[PDB]
Design a protein around this ligand. Structure first.
Ligand SMILES: Nc1ncnc2c1ncn2[C@@H]1O[C@H](COP(=O)(O)OP(=O)(O)OP(=O)(O)O)[C@@H](O)[C@H]1O
Ligand SMILES: Nc1ncnc2c1ncn2[C@@H]1O[C@H](COP(=O)(O)OP(=O)(O)OP(=O)(O)O)[C@@H](O)[C@H]1O
Ligand SMILES: OC[C@H]1O[C@H](O[C@H]2O[C@H](CO)[C@@H](O)[C@H](O)[C@H]2O)[C@H](O)[C@@H](O)[C@@H]1O
Lengths: 271, 437, 384, 282, 384
């Protein structure tokens, strides 16, 4: 029906506009020269790379990005392994009280950071150990594991373990058959859970901020939250906007690629 | 090879990078000097520093702190006192040739805990292209801005109005100027309303704040105008006036040479071609400074800080930076050689001449080349004869946040009940009770 | 290769294969019919090595095998689920068992292509599973069995998910390749009519005990018990629990004057007081039709036919009658899955018959098709 | 029985070595630490005190203002984020076109770094600067007044958190067979009762976990107030009060009492869902 | 309701509901039939208002139903998947349309009790579904319809979601229900046996238009075309091409002479070129039996038997030949999905037959339905 198809065509662009303009705004506010800073036009003029050149001029961002990625990978891997090791027992084993073990994790996933920050800073994790990566990786892992348990449990409810029964008639030895049959089906699940943990662990500001304060471990959200101008007497907003555009630039292209996996993992395969 | 982490607030980074480079070139192979930025804001500057000592960081060596806090660090046993050089030299170098006021900020109880490096008071900046003699009284200043508002001109006052320790500077200048003070001389008790003369002082100071906060044609965001906004408001041509610090000078000249401010087209003159540095700083030649300033002085300029009464020149509040050596650094004899050469008598020539901060080595204000290149020098010296300190006691910061938080909006205050409100909050902060917001 | 098993057992918190035995010669497609919740899948799992023999023994001709590992034993199962490895191509899914058995890649390329020519996959084989039709998918699961030139074949109701027109089609293809292989083989089912379409000897269970076994024509013509008799054949037998009267059974619409051809074969033992008599709907005639001496003597009665319908070339015709329908021995045991409204009896006429719903129809019956069982036991008096 | 039980307990054991000594132990230490006259600038002397930290937080007005403000922002943000997220889910579920364009766009505000999403609003709502702020009247002062400031805090958090909630509702809703709707439709419900009478009573468990997960995460907010107003004008939410009382003043005893009192308040919110609404795991 | 529908014209960017017209009436039970994809569900959806009437009109009572809303456009419907709201009680699932229609609570209670006695649900209406499983839920779904006492009814295809055995009770109770109601109903299927059972008329369609419609016994006995004759009476004829023959027919195993009455039809019009002969699996017999005064015209033959069906209620065999019989006007659509083969055939034989596999099966034919068809259009010549 051409009128209702037009109405849907309108609804589709409206929701795209709602999601994109507060992003394109940052790009435009960054690209606007300091003459067009304080000029109210959203449509830019005389756009310049000078602010982006000023981000990479001096080593201030290199360590923030490189530490964000390093912490992302290590907290992903340790969460994926122990979260998968839990998820196999949560799916395949049928032990008494198993609902408690899944129930408590989805609660501590939501726990209030401004509680945890006081005791940890006043412990051997801030007085003994302090700013080096373990002082973040240990709390990061804790908020990551529940998301690993949920998403990996959803993938292990999806795999038919009766494929193992078929495999145990395709010869017998599981140390060959299970190894060769099951891993190709496990892979798209585990890589999706790894992506979602990497992103979910990326942006917990209160712990990233409160436990670091060095050129090592001052991760990408903290770097921009301490940043307040590239220069002495330039209007700082264009430089801040450039920094925000730099920091976001990886994770947009990252989620842009893996969309089916991302929505399936959160939706437990429902879409 | 060892490197020394020199912490600085972010407002004077390019200056301390130039100073750091000089020192790093002068020192030879001993060790490197490297700068680090704390935030721009006058208590976040403390937050990110105390967090590096409450946790035992080894990446903290030399730190620039605000003249207001030092009693707290000293009483906490951080910021180890200047007696402890193997060279013995820092306690002499700190005493050697300073302005006397800043040096008296740097000792908690007889012993020095830091060495002064910069000091600053405030100047009343004004647009000579649209106004006559710089309004002396706050009342006359509001009168002149009212004229400009009715004429349709740059009506804003651009005061340091925000809920932070950098605003308590302003109020405490008004209270000191009106003849009151926050704490007793001994620091042991409140004194905001100790005598009915103090009641009159504080209530007048609050009326004056309320007046500037609410007069018709005021700047819309004046509850949230941080210090950095004031500089920008004048340079944007939106304010005919401000009461900023002594460093708005070069920032304007720089923002007139590198394209920028429409009322001063110095960017149009061949004399300034290549005058700005390839690191992005200004740093003109002597003739380029002189022509930039001689073009500016007809449009833009300064005066001593306005009075509460018609004829009582203000007890303007003392500000600055004191360098200290941290407790936690593993080596530290090397950090004392760093502080000595960071406050070197040549080194701080650049700190004023191009960095905008007033130097503390006394002779620089007598020297002719400095007195030429630093044209505001005589007003600063003058004010440092009568400039009021903030009350040195370790509770200061806990008081100053309580006082500011009681004046949460800068408008919207009943002066009389707010005077009691200030006394109550300040009392509780000396008592150390309750929660800071 | 033949197989045998004896004295068998299973257990669950339920003796699912309690005291079973069988022999499974070359070429025998043994069909294991019965109600769901017998030891069906579980006995095929025992034979496949996926289940535990709690007592008794199994033999693949070459050895006893209940003692043996899941290595060897009943090779070449196919799955009721049509289970496959969906990341692989269909050609790879056919090839996989031979590649796991280290078969050379030229030997794969031959036996994969021959199997894909036997099956309906010769064009489709380059695709992944699930991107393909369910009969082809099932066919790949049969390919998985076919490729391993196996000792046996195990079917697991492989017509499960198909529509009926495709079930009977694939039943022919299974018959061809069962005969072409000559394997000893097995196929469990709950479908009685489908079990008549192929296979050398039906076997039937009440739960874990064999009720009967034999070739399905012998099974249909000479059933041992009312349970196995009533389960067999498409038209369910009209059963009358009844008084075992001296003339033969006196059903009140048209009494059975039983001739000596069974009545003297009854009188060779002490006669029962009560019986259940069964007759096949296919054995009734319209009494207004047929020809010769049968039209007089065929046990005739009239009842108001409560429905009729043609089914194409015939008419199924329905009516109600008296009988002791509240009691059971091997009858309520069927009523578990189906069987109610005991008074509703059914008959079969040709489409040439002028009969219709809602009229008094004369029906004719004879003693050649009659069957009788103990009202106390459900065991047949007519045959073992 | 015991063989797979033994295997399972040994596979679970790492995920209770972690998520105990790095959750329950920190909290348990935070309890003891709340019983102390302990200031972080003088660790050479400390004293046990019975209740004075808890009584202080329970009676000082700076707790109750910040606390009441988090409840307000919680209920206002969650209600809007739900009602929008429901509509957003339905659009991306039922749109007739190649939906991958909409699925692309709806992930972006989910994925994006919370601080960068926040500077966007900070400049959009500052006068002479934001394309949005520039179309309020002169003298409007958009960001400095308390209630307008709270409105801008809410806007950033609904724009940032509603896409995740639209996925939890979508996953709660895409399970629903279309014929149940075809039946309600031919039975004459129309769209209003197709929503209210038909589908919502199915999706109850999914909407309850979605509301809970948005509620606790909306309670413990920080960055979108810190980057955007710094707790000024008394706008500071409950987490930011627990920041200043440890790193702007050093009384770790009181900052520990805030740390516990937050946590018991979150626990009571979770209890209302888990008992009074059931809300069990999906 | 008056049930008059015409000129579908719903064709997609694909003929779909393209030429259809219905002419249905009060009290009728109609079956809609064909292969998958014909627009059977789409025409039912247009009747249900789930699509709006593109061309012509749909009417019942005095109403332009074609132009009406989806709400109450068809006053009852039932769905294959047993559509059932899982959160509710079973009683609430039944009451749902009546509480949508805001009927008073005493009327709800009386009518739900009535409905839950019209179906055997009186012990279940208190319990939630899933606790009330699919074997009861199948009844609950059609319970929804009954609370309206509906002016017209759409069945969809309920029985095929259920397992094959229970359909004996399900189809009996569905027919009883229609008997108890005395009102119009329509049904859809992909199977001819499901249509012939309990139907008043059958409509067969393809590509959004009717191929033929009528009483099912005429549709069977008198097909419009050979592809329709392959659909109704699912044991389809053996079909063979010929050029022409001056007395009757030629076959791979014999010849037919019949009588002049059918040859008159062939010479009744200009259709003597390529033609089809189509003979049922019915009208075939074992040549050892049915001899007599008919035996001279029984036209005996023999073919080697490869496979047999032998359940004893009746019997039948496959038979085979060689030849280029792969021709199709539209018959490939019937060949595509069951028993596929160019020279593959079947015959019925009576239970008295004793023939087996691996031997020459001697057989005879009954003249009284032998039939002939246009090779160009597929049309039946003997009766339309
Ligand atoms: N591993 C097991 N543990 C416990 N009980 C079992 C197990 N395997 C089977 N059973 C029992 O056997 C029954 C399942 O039937 P079985 O697997 O023997 O064949 P079936 O599935 O009934 O046959 P069909 O596949 O034809 O339906 C269940 O009711 C269950 O109680
Ligand atoms: N809303 C629609 N848009 C486009 N095409 C449709 C729509 N509804 C139905 N169709 C067409 O109708 C067909 C599906 O319904 P139809 O009754 O024609 O066949 P079917 O339902 O698959 O058959 P069966 O009911 O036997 O499975 C599809 O091939 C499709 O092209
Ligand atoms: O000169 C640059 C410095 O200006 C501010 O410091 C002044 O105002 C303070 C409070 O904000 C006073 O306490 C201080 O004594 C003054 O120097 C600013 O706070 C600093 O960060 C700048 O470095």
């Amino acid at each position: 029906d051409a009128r209702r198809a037009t109405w849907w065509s309108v609804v589709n662009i409206l929701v795209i506009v709602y999601a994109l303009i507060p992003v394109l705004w940052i790009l435009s506010l960054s690209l606007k020269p300091t003459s067009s800073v304080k000029d109210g036009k959203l449509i830019p003029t005389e756009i310049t790379f000078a602010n982006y050149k000023a981000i990479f001029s001096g080593d201030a961002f290199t360590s923030a990005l490189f530490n964000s990625i390093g912490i992302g990978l290590i907290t992903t891997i340790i969460a994926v392994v122990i979260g998968g090791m839990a998820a196999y027992a949560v799916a395949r084993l049928q032990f008494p009280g198993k609902q408690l073990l899944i129930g408590v994790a989805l609660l501590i996933a939501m726990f209030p950071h401004i509680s945890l920050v006081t005791p940890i800073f006043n412990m051997w994790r801030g007085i003994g150990l302090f700013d080096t990566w373990p002082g973040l990786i240990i709390p990061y892992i804790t908020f990551a594991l529940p998301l690993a348990i949920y998403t990996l449990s959803a993938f292990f409810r999806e795999i038919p373990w009766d494929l193992e029964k078929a495999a145990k008639m395709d010869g017998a030895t599981p140390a060959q058959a299970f190894r060769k049959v099951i891993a190709p089906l496990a892979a798209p699940g585990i890589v999706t859970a790894a992506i979602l943990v990497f992103i979910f662990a990326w942006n917990d500001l209160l712990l990233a901020l409160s436990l670091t304060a060095t050129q090592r471990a001052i991760t990408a959200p903290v770097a921009i939250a301490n940043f307040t101008g590239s220069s002495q007497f330039e209007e700082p907003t264009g430089s801040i906007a450039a920094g925000a555009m730099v920091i976001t630039i990886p994770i947009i292209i990252f989620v842009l690629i893996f969309q089916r996996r991302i929505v399936a993992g959160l939706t437990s395969g429902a879409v | 090879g060892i490197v020394i982490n020199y912490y600085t607030p972010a407002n004077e980074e390019a200056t301390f990078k130039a100073v750091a480079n000089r020192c790093n070139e002068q020192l030879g192979g001993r060790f490197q000097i490297a700068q680090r930025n704390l935030p721009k804001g006058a208590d976040d500057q403390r937050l990110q520093l105390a967090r590096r000592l409450t946790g035992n960081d080894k990446s903290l060596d030399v730190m620039a702190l605000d003249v207001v806090w030092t009693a707290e660090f000293a009483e906490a046993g951080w910021a180890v006192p200047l007696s402890e050089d193997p060279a013995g030299l820092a306690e002499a170098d700190a005493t050697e040739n300073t302005l006397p006021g800043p040096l008296e900020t740097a000792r908690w109880q007889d012993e020095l805990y830091a060495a002064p490096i910069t000091t600053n008071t405030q100047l009343l900046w004004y647009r000579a292209d649209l106004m006559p003699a710089p309004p002396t009284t706050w009342d006359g200043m509001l009168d002149e801005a009212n004229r400009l508002y009715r004429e349709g001109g740059p009506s804003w006052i651009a005061v340091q109005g925000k809920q932070y320790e950098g605003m308590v500077v302003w109020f405490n200048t008004l209270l000191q100027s009106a003849g009151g003070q926050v704490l007793s001389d001994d620091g042991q008790r409140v004194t905001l309303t100790d005598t009915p003369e103090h009641r009159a002082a504080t209530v007048k100071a609050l009326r004056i704040i309320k007046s500037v906060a609410t007069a018709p044609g005021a700047d819309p965001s004046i509850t949230q105008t941080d210090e950095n906004t004031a500089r920008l408001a004048l340079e944007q041509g939106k304010a005919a006036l401000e009461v900023n610090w002594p460093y708005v000078l070069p920032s304007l000249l720089e923002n007139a040479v590198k394209g920028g401010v429409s009322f001063l087209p110095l960017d149009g003159d061949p004399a300034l071609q290549g005058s700005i540095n390839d690191v992005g700083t200004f740093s003109p030649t002597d003739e380029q400074f002189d022509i930039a300033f001689d073009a500016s002085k007809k449009v833009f300029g300064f005066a001593p800080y306005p009075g509460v009464n018609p004829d009582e020149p203000a007890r303007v509040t003392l500000g600055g930076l004191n360098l200290a050596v941290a407790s936690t650094s593993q080596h530290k004899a090397e950090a004392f050689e760093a502080i000595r050469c960071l406050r070197n008598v040549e080194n701080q020539r650049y700190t004023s001449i191009e960095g905008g901060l007033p130097a503390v080595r006394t002779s620089l204000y007598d020297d002719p080349a400095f007195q030429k290149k630093y044209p505001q020098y005589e007003i600063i010296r003058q004010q440092l004869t009568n400039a009021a300190v903030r009350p040195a006691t370790p509770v200061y910061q806990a008081v100053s946040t309580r006082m500011s938080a009681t004046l949460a909006p800068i408008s919207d205050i009943d002066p009389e009940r707010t005077a009691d409100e200030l006394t109550e909050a300040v009392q509780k902060a000396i008592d150390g009770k309750g929660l800071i917001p | 290769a033949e197989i045998v098993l004896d004295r068998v057992t299973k257990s669950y918190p339920r003796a699912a294969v309690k005291e079973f035995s069988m022999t499974i010669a070359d070429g025998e497609f043994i069909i294991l019919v019965g109600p769901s919740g017998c030891g069906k899948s579980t006995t095929l799992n025992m034979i496949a090595g996926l289940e535990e023999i709690t007592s008794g023994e199994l033999r693949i001709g070459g050895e006893r095998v209940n003692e043996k590992a899941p290595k060897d034993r009943d090779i070449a199962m196919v799955f009721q689920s049509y289970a496959l490895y969906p990341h692989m191509t269909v050609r790879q899914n056919i090839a996989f068992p031979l590649t796991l058995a280290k078969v050379p890649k030229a030997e794969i390329a031959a036996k994969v292509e021959e199997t894909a020519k036997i099956l309906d996959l010769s064009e489709l084989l380059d695709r992944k599973p699930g991107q393909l039709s369910g009969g082809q998918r099932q066919r790949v699961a049969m390919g998985r069995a076919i490729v391993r030139s196996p000792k046996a074949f195990l079917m697991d109701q492989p017509l499960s998910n198909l529509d009926a027109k495709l079930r009977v089609q694939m039943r022919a293809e299974i018959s061809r390749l069962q005969d072409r292989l000559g394997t000893t083989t097995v196929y469990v089912t709950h479908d009685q009519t489908e079990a008549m379409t192929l296979g050398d000897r039906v076997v039937v269970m009440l739960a874990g005990e064999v009720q009967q076994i034999g070739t399905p024509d012998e099974l249909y013509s000479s059933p041992a018990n009312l349970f196995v008799a009533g389960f067999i054949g498409s038209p369910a037998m009209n059963f009358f629990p009844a008084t075992r009267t001296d003339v033969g059974v006196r059903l009140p619409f048209g009494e059975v004057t039983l001739t000596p051809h069974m009545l003297d074969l009854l009188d060779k033992q002490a006669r029962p007081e009560n019986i259940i008599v069964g007759i096949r709907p296919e054995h009734i005639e319209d009494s207004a039709l047929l020809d010769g001496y049968a039209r007089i003597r065929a046990l005739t009665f009239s009842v108001r036919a409560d429905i009729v319908e043609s089914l194409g070339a015939d008419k199924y015709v329905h009516f109600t009658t008296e009988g002791a329908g509240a009691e059971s021995a091997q009858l309520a045991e069927l009523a578990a899955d189906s069987g109610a409204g005991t008074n509703q009896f059914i008959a079969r006429v040709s489409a040439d018959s002028r009969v219709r719903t809602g009229e008094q129809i004369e029906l004719a019956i004879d003693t050649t098709k009659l069957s009788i069982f103990d009202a106390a036991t459900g065991l047949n008096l007519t045959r073992d | 029985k015991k063989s797979e039980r033994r295997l399972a307990f040994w596979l679970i054991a790492p995920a209770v070595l972690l998520m105990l000594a790095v959750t329950a132990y920190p909290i348990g230490y935070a309890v003891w630490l709340s019983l102390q006259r302990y200031n972080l600038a003088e660790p050479h002397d400390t004293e046990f005190i019975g209740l004075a930290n808890y009584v202080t937080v329970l009676t000082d007005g700076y707790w109750w203002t910040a606390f009441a403000v988090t409840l307000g922002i919680t209920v206002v943000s969650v209600a809007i984020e739900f009602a929008l997220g429901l509509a957003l889910a339905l659009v991306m579920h039922r749109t007739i076109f190649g939906k991958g364009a909409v699925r692309t766009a709806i992930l972006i505000p989910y994925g994006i770094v919370t601080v960068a999403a926040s500077y966007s609003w900070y400049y959009a709502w500052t006068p002479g600067t934001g394309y949005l702020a520039n179309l309020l009247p002169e003298g409007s002062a958009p960001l400095t007044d308390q209630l307008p400031s709270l409105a801008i805090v809410v806007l950033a958090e609904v724009w940032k958190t509603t896409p995740f909630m639209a996925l939890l509702l979508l996953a709660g809703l895409a399970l629903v067979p279309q014929d149940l709707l075809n039946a309600a439709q031919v039975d004459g419900a129309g769209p209003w009762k197709r929503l209210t009478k038909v589908i919502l009573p199915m999706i109850k468990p999914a909407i309850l976990v979605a509301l809970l997960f948005r509620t606790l995460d909306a309670f413990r907010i920080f960055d979108n107030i810190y980057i955007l107003t710094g707790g000024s004008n008394d706008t500071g939410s409950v987490s930011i009060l627990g920041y200043d009382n440890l790193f702007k003043a050093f009384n770790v005893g009181l900052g520990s009492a805030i740390s516990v009192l937050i946590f018991l308040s979150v626990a009571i919110i979770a209890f209302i869902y888990i008992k009074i609404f059931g809300a069990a795991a999906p």
